[PDB]
Design a binder for this molecule. Structure first.
Ligand SMILES: *[C@@H]1O[C@H](CO)[C@@H](O)[C@H](O)[C@H]1NC(C)=O
Ligand SMILES: *[C@@H]1O[C@H](CO)[C@@H](O)[C@H](O)[C@H]1NC(C)=O
Ligand SMILES: *[C@@H]1O[C@H](CO)[C@@H](O)[C@H](O)[C@H]1NC(C)=O
Ligand SMILES: *[C@@H]1O[C@H](CO)[C@@H](O)[C@H](O)[C@H]1NC(C)=O
Ligand SMILES: *[C@@H]1O[C@H](CO)[C@@H](O)[C@H](O)[C@H]1NC(C)=O
Ligand SMILES: *[C@@H]1O[C@H](CO)[C@@H](O)[C@H](O)[C@H]1NC(C)=O
Ligand SMILES: *[C@@H]1O[C@H](CO)[C@@H](O)[C@H](O)[C@H]1NC(C)=O
Ligand SMILES: *[C@@H]1O[C@H](CO)[C@@H](O)[C@H](O)[C@H]1NC(C)=O
Lengths: 464, 464, 464, 464
């Protein structure tokens, strides 16, 4: 078992590869990360391309549109409602003659089966909608009927009470020429454009929005980097295999330990080990495996069902790097000249975790105040929602000036509430602020307490 | 008395219901809270409905209105003054032909007795108002006269010196169809609209505003959730009763103690007990009772006089949850593995409270600086008012960049004041900031001091 | 001398008026403060009146004026320059027919001797200004000539190179009717209006501004509160006298002490006493005297030369209240149950003051970085100026997001500077932030150090 | 060697010039700094002149330009594209008749060789650009061709697919008259104006910008301050020489020490000395030398190749002052009554530096989260870029309200991401905030730890 203890001890190489593999993976893993950033950078530019395209589309297909008007862009009058739709209509008609871009649209029918449009002007309304507020009655069959008019590239009215929503659907193709700057072959994009005039609230206000989906592929006529990505993916598989192997060794050790604690004296009893870290030699590899598995997956099987899947997988990769980033420093610390910083973290959670819950508890009540208080005035608080948003306010500056004072002159109303709003909000800023440092501080003192001890398996060691 | 001591000790069940009741109430209480949130969520949507309606009304009845113009929307010329009024007038005339909503208005006369309008264009002016600034005199009978013109759904001038204010009052009814999305029967709303052109300042500037009151009821032709709310209300009564019972037990204990301290030796003397907490076993129940009493009340007797009363009662409920929230954790802590976090709070107040007053004292002077300084420049400081608002600035970021620098280039004026404004405001940021952490810190150290002891009835215990 | 020691000890009354006087003064002083706030509140409203008037005047006399355009309101073309001047001109002509206020203007000539205008359209230009950039020469006699055109209430061009500035001066009288709401007799205001088209920079940009001075007096035909103010002023004199008396007693004590330290043994040697506080028994009274002297002065002798003097004096009053506020708590503390909070402040300054200078020193270098760095990009840093403004940024949030990031995409220019701007600004945020808490903290620990001793004349005491 | 030890000890003068030199340099150095500020202030005004000129030029040559529109100023339609160019064109034609300034432009051809314009309307496009998105192909010869039209002071169309960019280049001369206010002779400026209509992204959006370069010289017909600057430069040389001398002495001491440690016993072994500071007696002088060398250089040899070089050199000067500022206080401290503040800094770095890396490590992972997360939503995060920008957010307020909440309602998209964005960003705010104070705190405690020891060569000293 002495060998096993030595293994647990693991510097060891110096006493003397496997580390290189582990070392390679961060570099291997680090490189894949590099590949992701490189993929990420390209995506961002192309992400950049998408952003540019979106701004343009909004400006191109939107009438009366203004920057920062997205929050409020809407129609308020039938005369108001019609003009944009006509305005939108105009763009489809006249695009080749006015746009600063070169777009081509053909076929591409949606979204119900068949046929061509390119874009279909659709109308959705209740199959039956007798609405008579004057006599406080209505009679409704809420089944939604969709009437769509087809427009082929080179004036329809729906009753306002009737409208549920109006959409305009069309597709435009364009070449991504910017690629030439990054020494790449221009891409072939197909933009699916959806303009929605939403009347689902039947509020007299109809917000209008334009959204786009982008399908990207190689042009009609045409590996290097792709091959490199494939090699990177293969390396990741090797790293995952190495992790599985290490995991197996750890499991054997556990069996020895499970056997060992029991085995020597028919020995009892099992120990949770509390934090028992350390922690990462095994936990980290699995996460890495998850990150590794994900990359292959994004590159592979559900990449044949693209968009959400690609993005989600990327999120997993991030955990590995910082974990990937994190592991290296700990490996990197090499005891970090005795690893003083590392020890500091562990003590706090035990006290902090208990501390966190009470704080959440103190917080939960604070959060509820928001639910009751909010409805009467302000938009910041209104749902769990903003109530989550406030939580930002107490910790940090940006909120405090704007609500606390903006609120006081107020929308107001209710003399008591104005009395009420100060009474509570004011209460709110203070309690956490004095406490929070202490929780960090008391822990921080505790860390100092961790430090005081700090400032200056066991049996096995003794035996050795 | 040993039994009494055991009762004080109260884990006890484990030594062994009542806890379940107490337990039920938080769940019962927690559920009512859930009901409130559910009520709160519905209200917010409906609160949402109200917000939408308000924005729409402003846009609908307002001419030249702009978003964020509420702060400044006003008339400056008689030509200016007339146009909106005409503009407002137009809306009443032409609403059925231009609005994206379906409104019906009938009868509903206000606000002096009689009759119909629907909306009355009223004029208020001084019975006698000879105003002659050219000769520095005036002769006034300030009794206000109200002339109202009635307009029945399908050009009047008042002297500018004369105007006190002009109002436009009218009611519109509409069905709340959005309810269908939340699977509810559409509601019947009556919006009371009041547009005010306020000349009370006789400043040459007439701010114009539009406000609405909403009366909500079931449509003309038509329990589940209501029944559930009733059941919840009944449960609350049971909880209140349980609290009264517990309170009675506590009182009996107090009599024993009042009797006991005196009784054994003709014993003296009474002890305040300082904080004596703990604290919540009795204090918490009463608050809960207040919250419980309030819910029934909002649901019940002064709910037959609706609006302010409903809102105020909700505020009371919040105290119970966080208190409701708070109690559970303490109950929940079950000593919290020795309840270390809980102890921490108590020591500080004793020192902190003393600390808070001095700070208020340091603060009171700081606040006064604001009253004298403010009038000359800036709008942020001007009344107790903003002076309260500044208090936000020192603690948190949002204020500091905007005033301190915006002020320095300044509206300015007075070479000394510009010298003056920096001299003091600059003084202001520093003193609290170094101190405040210490007050938390010194307390925090004190908490550490609380901690240092921390880091590691009496007679009765000894006897036991 | 024992009696003298007892006097130094001063609770004493309880051992047993003078305190009541001292007590009266804060109340007396507190009341005067109350009077000031009352004066301050009235002034603020009237301050409110002034603000309203200013906004109105700007809107009234300004063409193309927009809110928040004050920062940028200016003319850029001769066609541009003329229109406002004509526009301003129009207002004088047509005011009685378009304004929502009632203004009367007569006589009131300015600003050179004579005569009437009411407002004079003045032109200032260099007596001689041959300016020929094409041949890189000029010949100038910088003496300024002022040509003014007089306009009597019921098209002049100056060469652009020629212009130094153009002003429009006129006076308008109006009655302050709002006073009626606060149950006061309307006031008689005379507004002196000055519109300036400033070409002193000869930059091609001419900023245009409108400013007003307000002369306030009783109407032509017409004590209570004034009498009360007078009584308050008299009380203040009594308080000052009491302070002088106390000061004399302190001086006698000092003579005893000066005599006493020397006298007993031909005794040496004098002690500075370091902080020797305490501190306020004498320091506070003098400040109070300054505040007291100032109030009488504002009310009295240089109030016959009004405006700056009135405002400056008010500033002095503030010191007394907070000092007025401050003294009471210390008196109020009555040892504050042993006055623990009070002791805390003293230790820190001794270490903190030393700390403050080094910090200023660390800061001075930080500030210089601003002077060199700033000119190239951004407006925030540019002069001592903004450089003062930045100092706000490090401590508090509002600055950090806006410059640090806004700067990075940047106006930029200079590849190194973009490298440069991050390199230094980034350096800037960190150094103070870690340190500052420590300075408070290290002091705060020191306060704890103050606390550690804390947590738990001499000869005279011993003798006693 | 005793003398050498005494030298190391260096108060010494009091035991007793060289200090005066050192003293002179800060004053000498301080004065040069003063000169720089004076130079800096003049530059800023002139910097002010440049800013004014830029705003004016933008307004003057820009059509439809709006303040704060710089971020977005662009053309979207050929009809849109043409108008500004015509608009810009108009300004060159009509400037003498509309501008509020007096500009003269002659000769000054750019930027390819020859000849006159003054401004050349240039067009850059691909030598060959067959672009056919409809058939997903293109055929391109990316060599850029530049066609420029010359316009001599008293309608050309390029295919949109074709455009790479269009520029307008012209020069204007003007006299800087404002100088008269600062009692200086007006300067002769030549502004090189470049307007760019950038189509390099071929995105359908063409951003338009105007930039200026300023060449400044004395007018055609015409030392004091220049002589003074020269004297200052000479003084700096003397200071540098003094530093070299001191450095030589230090080197001799090092030889003695290098000889001494080895020499006495054939002695070993060399000590790094860790921080060994102190530190500045030698390090500071060299930096000063760099600052000193730079000033002469800016004034001298590469000043005959002006602009970037002048600015960069200034940056070096700043290090000396704060270093210049810093040294004096340490010299100034004169042990600072035992120099307690100075000691405090040293201990922390040893622990802090280790702490900083781990933090960077914790941070590096945090930063990566940004790269993956950002692309989907928001502009704040998008590149290393903003990811750097976020780092501002956690420490300070301005960021936290705006992203955290603005993000939550969101651009959004992806139900998981909305789940995702909160899950991580929320994670992000907390971890550093509790930790950071501790790192300062734990160090701060450590500083206290530094303090605890604090609160209360060797061999050579002993010998002495
Ligand atoms: C075209 O649309 C009509 C419905 O309007 C549908 O019946 C028909 O099948 C469609 N044909 C094609 C080719 O899409
Ligand atoms: C109406 O809009 C909603 C999104 O707000 C969408 O889910 C629904 O399918 C649309 N229905 C019609 C008929 O457009
Ligand atoms: C109608 O208004 C007049 C006052 O203008 C009032 O005298 C009369 O009683 C009112 N009648 C009704 C039915 O409101
Ligand atoms: C004038 O407006 C005020 C509110 O600012 C209101 O209280 C008062 O009743 C109104 N009077 C008239 C005649 O409108
Ligand atoms: C009127 O102005 C002229 C200068 O234009 C001056 O000479 C004359 O004395 C003034 N008279 C009065 C009464 O102001
Ligand atoms: C020009 O304006 C300045 C203030 O910027 C003022 O001091 C000066 O007296 C004015 N001179 C003339 C002739 O208007
Ligand atoms: C003028 O420009 C033409 C090109 O358009 C060039 O060939 C010629 O040399 C130039 N001459 C001068 C004096 O710039
Ligand atoms: C186009 O603009 C870029 C800067 O964005 C510049 O570097 C390049 O020289 C320009 N080329 C032409 C032909 O204008």
């Amino acid at each position: 078992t002495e060998e096993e203890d030595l293994r647990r001890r693991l510097p060891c190489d110096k006493f003397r590869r496997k580390p290189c593999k582990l070392m390679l993976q961060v570099v291997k893993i680090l490189v894949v990360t590099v590949q992701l950033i490189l993929f990420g950078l390209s995506n961002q530019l192309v992400v950049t391309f998408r952003e540019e395209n979106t701004i343009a589309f909004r400006h191109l297909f939107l009438l009366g549109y203004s920057d920062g008007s997205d929050d409020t862009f809407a129609a308020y009058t039938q005369e108001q409602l019609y003009q944009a739709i006509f305005y939108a209509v105009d763009q489809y008609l006249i695009l080749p003659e006015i746009s600063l871009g070169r777009y081509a649209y053909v076929r591409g029918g949606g979204g119900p089966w068949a046929n061509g449009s390119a874009l279909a002007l659709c109308q959705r309304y209740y199959h039956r909608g007798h609405v008579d507020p004057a006599n406080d009655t209505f009679d409704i069959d809420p089944r939604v009927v969709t009437d769509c008019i087809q427009v082929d590239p080179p004036n329809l009215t729906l009753k306002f009470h009737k409208l549920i929503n109006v959409t305009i659907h069309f597709q435009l193709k364009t070449i991504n020429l910017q690629s030439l700057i990054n020494n790449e072959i221009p891409d072939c994009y197909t933009f699916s454009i959806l303009i929605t005039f939403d009347n689902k609230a039947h509020s007299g206000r109809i917000p209008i929005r334009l959204e786009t989906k982008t399908h990207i592929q190689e042009c009609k006529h045409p590996s290097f980097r792709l091959l490199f990505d494939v090699v990177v993916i293969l390396t990741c598989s090797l790293s995952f295999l190495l992790c599985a192997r290490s995991l197996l060794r750890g499991f054997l050790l556990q069996n020895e330990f499970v056997v060992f604690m029991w085995r020597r004296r028919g020995r009892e009893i099992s120990l949770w080990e509390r934090l028992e870290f350390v922690n990462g030699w095994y936990i980290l590899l699995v996460t890495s495996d998850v990150l590794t598995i994900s990359g292959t997956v994004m590159k592979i099987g559900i990449e044949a069902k693209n968009l959400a899947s690609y993005d989600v997988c990327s999120i997993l990769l991030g955990t590995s790097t910082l974990l990937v980033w994190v592991g290296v420093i700990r490996y990197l610390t090499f005891f970090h000249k005795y690893n003083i910083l590392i020890a500091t973290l562990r003590v706090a959670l035990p006290s902090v975790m208990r501390f966190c819950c009470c704080v959440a508890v103190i917080y939960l009540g604070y959060c509820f105040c928001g639910w009751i208080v909010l409805g009467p005035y302000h938009v910041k608080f209104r749902s769990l929602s903003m109530v989550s948003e406030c939580l930002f306010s107490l910790i940090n500056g940006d909120d405090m000036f704007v609500t606390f004072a903006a609120m006081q002159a107020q929308q107001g109303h209710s003399s008591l509430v104005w009395l009420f709003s100060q009474l509570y909000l004011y209460s709110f800023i203070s309690l956490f602020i004095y406490m929070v440092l202490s929780l960090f501080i008391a822990l921080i003192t505790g860390a100092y307490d961790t430090i005081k001890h700090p400032g200056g398996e066991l049996q096995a060691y003794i035996e050795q």
